[PDB]
């Protein structure tokens, strides 16, 4: 099977497996795991922030950030197709008692004027707007890179109102590799950033939240409440340090493989826009096929290629360390064989 | 002052004042207030439902309905400009732990195909869609009437998936008067309807939720939790019986006054669409004026007319029993004088 | 029927009925109801506070106070048998996301040393203690009066830790009449007090929260969220002004009737402690009877007397304006006849 | 340092470190991690249950169980000193919207008659009792073993009412070793059991929830919402399998070391009851010392022994794999040297 479903399926490198076996550990509830502590120090340093917090998932990273930024009855502005709204189980309503205010963007970029219009006036009928969340890269639109200028303008709006800014940077190193913007420059326009270790950077488990000391203290207590306060989690942090410090540069290979995949899919005749492919994701539309996305996914699966439908007419293909150029070429031979069987 | 801010400002009639003074009362927590019990009986009968529940506000009516229809973490589909999302203080997230799924409609009518697309499939990442809310009339769009066929098709969609349907019928009698659809007919396509007594029907306080016996018992316990469990509330229900049984027919006068207001505002030169005015509300746009909506609201207030801005470029004018045709004519004179000094 | 179930069953006086009929009203959402505004002014003045808030029930009064005093995850210290824990539908957990810390008291008075021990230290495992609630009079223990020195010492403890203090003063005027302590004096040791109009003071609907300006504005927004934001509620406030200004002194009659009831029940042979009866409630124990409290309640109801069991072995009898000494004498005759057939 | 603070401080065995490095992993969000899957199969088999769910902490295990057993506004009966109430950050109120009903027990055993009395009647004022939680062993009382007969009688009560039963079995294998009761026999009297891998069984991270298939499916979705849905968590489950299958028998050594510690502390002159010591915990009281528990903890820390104060007059000592008999003897020499310096 060639697995193009997600970059979460990456398996740990040999260096990571060794580091996990040899990890120096302690009880993180007492702040005594030295490898967790070093991962958090490195993460804060990398992002230009005072403090950092390891969490067992990107979902938890986002939700403790929302909890630490908000009070009950607040409203959170976020992009209408972003992960926090789409695919985090409604946690923001249950855990934090906040409402989402979905703003449809273009490729993850909310028009700053629409962000302005979404902020609630001080009026007894309205929730209090206390948080704006930005996702970079933006998953649903195809791993698109949100321009730094968009983040800067939204930060400017937030400072005018006293509103917190959170970046869902699950794939912020993919954004950085594609744009040349260092992650600490994105992070300078936010109060908090969540970034994942367990996607393209190939750690088996985890993400990190970075921000100011007082915010991270609140987020750490939120983590305890949600159940993310682990014991000898240095076993995980050992792999996370390798992910953060050694696995960023090679994300360029995933980007090259996704672009090559898209170029050749277009040549075959599929509805793909290679010009849209800036990081490790390709959106393929079924408009010129007689099957819908779900039927094409099943046909691919039966032919040895795993992918996911993100709508009835769109499939998402995701590259990562565990699909090589050889694997991409094999997948393309499978896509080529299938095209005459599914074309309209 | 000529008050076009809202139809909530209606004061009780002399008949209502007499009825409140001599209301037969009892302790509603024990179900022993005879006037509450008769109002609920009349309301259930009027709407063709098994049971009904008096509440002190339309907000509480919507929120106990949401609580009784949902579990924590569920999603509620509703129109993106509907009152439950716009102007109920984020209560659905705080009180029920549910997420709104805002669907932008056309004049309050969500496209049924967009409703279909908004229902979550059963994946672990997604909330469970358990409720669809429809607002009729639709406030923000200008008191617009949602077509019965829209409500009917959404009811069919909901039945398929085992999803509940709630009508926010704050102004459902205005809708009925304008469409000719009996309120019982609207209500047959919903599990619950909230309708207000304290707006155009001129009661001083309250709304009523109608629905099935088991739903209403759940909503009654939700009412107790939220603090709507009153004692000798028959004082209020006495005016409510008069509102429900005697004040519906004259809503036609409010509609005629709103249509007259809109026609004459257009003749003066203001940006109004009299063809959009089907019940008791008029939207005026400030696009051809030197001031925005907030500037115009202040100019109007200084000149003796009260209205509200619903955006930076739109004001909402609402007619009701306590603005006569005389008052509308006087307001139009004020609008005419103001036009030369606000015109662009 | 002779109704000893509760003092909530009080019906409005003729003076109240006239006042409701001619109440001067306005839209309370705009702060424009003159009778609500005067009731809140009188209430704040009576209790020595900056501001006040009318609410439709004592439950809502307590719950908006909790919301305005707390953040999600906080803990609220309160007496283990107090109404907020016992009989407010778990609202503090649902609406505010706070945990109760029940402290068993003696006659409603929590030992201040137990309050000290219940305050959480700052550890990551513990909620933040942000509120202490005191109930005076204390309902479940038999309408008992919490000593002023208890309230004073708990106030000192709370001030030390920056913890808010709420008095559930549903029956604070009963406490004041029995103790000689002015309600303003009780209230000076609390941040907020909720007191009821709809119990012994005989208004048909409502309670009032008093406190600081900023707290009351937070509580007013909480009221909007919960659905207590009414329109022309001056109809209710007119009766409330009469309740607050004219119905306090005669609570002495309720106390005398309760004490007479208890003395005569003991003379008959029932298990009652007349020395415990300081306001308008009597606890009767069924330990020397063939029936339990529920069996005795049914026997009483069949004989024309309404009361409530508060446990399997205890019934609560409550006096109020609508049970005269004549009615108490008639109830005692019924109790005497029943004794020979229920006695053990 | 001799660390008697907790059994959470256990470090992974050499066999665990090897197994983590060699773990066969996959993406647990897709159910594709074979080592997680095998751990869950083994756990369900061991406890006689249909299904099992790995979680990153015991706190998360308890809280997803509460979420899966309850609806908003429910009440949970639990022992007044149990971990869910004492030390889980008020999560049950925030995450599930439920109230605790603390019942003071004797050594973790709630009197079944008190459990009966705590169940709420069906009444509009009351939350719905839907869950009873039992903790075995009971931490705060000194690692005490709850008798099987207590669990059986509480199960009997729950079946009469349709109430769910959850065992907080963080240390259920310690209970089993001490009592001879197999864990699947305890579990047969519960709907769910949470047990920890990361305490005495020496895994670095994690716990497991066991129960019926439908309950575990709900708990798995709760885990996704809280942020416990990890990716290649087979690295952790590899150690967890060794913990579950190889580390249970040697808990007897921890019990022998705790009993030896207690016997010799009593001989030295400290206020310890060796007869109370049935598993791996010892409570030492400071009643006969001139210092309180906090001062004694600091004196111990400065002398090379780590422990924790659980009140102002009580310290808890906890044995585990990483304190040997040699370490216990060294700690006792330190306790002996200190006694003349702190005795009253
Ligand atoms: C932008 C963003 N933010 C947060 C998370 C939550 O991170 P998690 O809780 O899964 O560790 C994710 C997870 N995406 C998983 C996925 C699956 C298939 C294809 C692509 N992506 C995310 O894309
Ligand atoms: C559709 C709808 N649903 C619920 C409510 C809540 O009802 P309340 O809690 O206020 O009783 C309202 C209230 N509209 C008040 C208003 C003010 C100004 C202009 C127009 N309308 C509503 O329009
Ligand atoms: C101390 C206290 N606080 C708040 C409330 C809530 O107030 P409500 O939401 O009902 O307006 C009550 C209500 N007691 C009603 C009752 C019934 C039978 C016998 C005695 N009392 C209360 O005693
Ligand atoms: C009975 C019980 N249940 C759940 C948990 C939560 O498990 P956690 O979320 O920490 O993995 C714990 C944790 N006790 C940690 C501790 C520290 C010091 C001394 C003794 N114990 C527990 O004792
Ligand atoms: Ca900032
Ligand atoms: Ca991975
Ligand atoms: Ca239906
Ligand atoms: Ca009105
Ligand atoms: Ca104060
Ligand atoms: Ca009354
Ligand atoms: Ca069962
Ligand atoms: Ca451990």
From TrEMBL, chains A, B, C, D:
Keyword Lyase in record: yes
Keywords, ordered alphabetically: Calcium, Lyase, Metal-binding, Pyridoxal phosphate
Binding, pyridoxal 5'-phosphate: 58-59, 171, 231
Binding annotation for Ca(2+) 1: 10, 198, 232
Residues holding Ca(2+) 4: 326, 329
Residues annotated to bind Ca(2+) 2: 288
Pfam families for the chain: Beta_elim_lyase
A molecular-function term among this protein's GO annotations: metal ion binding
CDD domains: TA_like
Cofactor(s) this protein cannot do without: pyridoxal 5'-phosphate
Keyword Lyase part of the UniProt annotation: yes
Gene3D superfamilies linked to this entry: Aspartate Aminotransferase, domain 1, Type I PLP-dependent aspartate aminotransferase-like (Major domain)
Entry GO terms, CC: cytosol
Modification N6-(pyridoxal phosphate)lysine, positions: 199
GO biological process, one term: glycine biosynthetic process
Top-level taxon: Bacteria
InterPro entries cross-referenced by the UniProt entry: ArAA_b-elim_lyase/Thr_aldolase, Low_specificity_L-TA-like, PyrdxlP-dep_Trfase, PyrdxlP-dep_Trfase_major, PyrdxlP-dep_Trfase_small
Coiled-coil region: none
Domain Aromatic amino acid beta-eliminating lyase/threonine aldolase: 3-285
Residues that, per the record, bind Ca(2+) 3: 322
Family label: Belongs to the threonine aldolase family.
PANTHER family for the chain: L-THREONINE ALDOLASE, L-THREONINE ALDOLASE-RELATED
Name by which UniProt lists this protein: L-allo-threonine aldolase
Organism this protein belongs to: Thermotoga maritima (strain ATCC 43589 / DSM 3109 / JCM 10099 / NBRC 100826 / MSB8)
């Amino acid at each position: 099977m060639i697995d193009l479903r997600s970059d979460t399926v990456t398996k740990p490198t040999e260096e990571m497996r060794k580091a996990m076996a040899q990890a120096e550990v302690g009880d993180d509830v007492y702040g005594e795991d030295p490898t967790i502590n070093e991962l958090e120090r490195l993460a804060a340093e990398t992002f230009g922030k005072e403090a950092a917090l390891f969490v067992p998932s990107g979902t938890m990273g986002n939700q403790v950030s929302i909890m630490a930024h908000t009070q009950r009855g607040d409203e959170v502005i976020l992009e209408a197709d972003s992960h926090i709204f789409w695919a985090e189980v409604g946690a923001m309503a249950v855990l934090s008692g906040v409402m989402p205010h979905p703003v449809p963007g273009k490729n993850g970029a909310m028009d700053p004027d629409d962000v302005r219009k979404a902020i609630r006036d001080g009026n007894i009928h309205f929730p209090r707007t206390s948080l704006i969340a930005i996702e970079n890269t933006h998953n649903r639109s195809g791993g698109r890179v949100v321009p730094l200028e968009n983040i800067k303008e939204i930060c400017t709006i937030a400072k005018e109102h006293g509103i917190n800014v959170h970046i869902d940077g699950a794939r912020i190193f993919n954004a950085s590799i594609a744009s040349g913007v260092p992650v600490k420059e994105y992070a300078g326009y936010a109060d908090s950033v969540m970034f994942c270790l367990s996607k393209g950077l190939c750690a088996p488990v985890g993400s990190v939240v970075v921000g100011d000391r007082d915010f991270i203290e609140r987020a750490r207590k939120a983590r305890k409440m949600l159940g993310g306060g682990m014991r000898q989690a240095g076993v995980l942090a050992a792999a996370g340090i390798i992910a953060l410090t050694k696995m960023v540069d090679r994300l360029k290979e995933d980007h090259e493989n996704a672009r090559f995949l898209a170029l050749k899919l277009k040549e075959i005749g599929y509805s793909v826009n290679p010009e849209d492919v800036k990081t490790n994701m390709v959106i393929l539309r079924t408009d010129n096929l007689k099957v819908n996305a779900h039927g094409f996914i099943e046909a691919l699966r039966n032919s040895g290629v795993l992918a996911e439908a993100v709508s009835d007419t769109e499939i998402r293909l995701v590259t990562h360390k565990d699909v090589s150029r050889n694997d991409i070429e094999e997948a393309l031979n499978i896509f080529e064989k299938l095209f005459s069987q599914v074309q309209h």
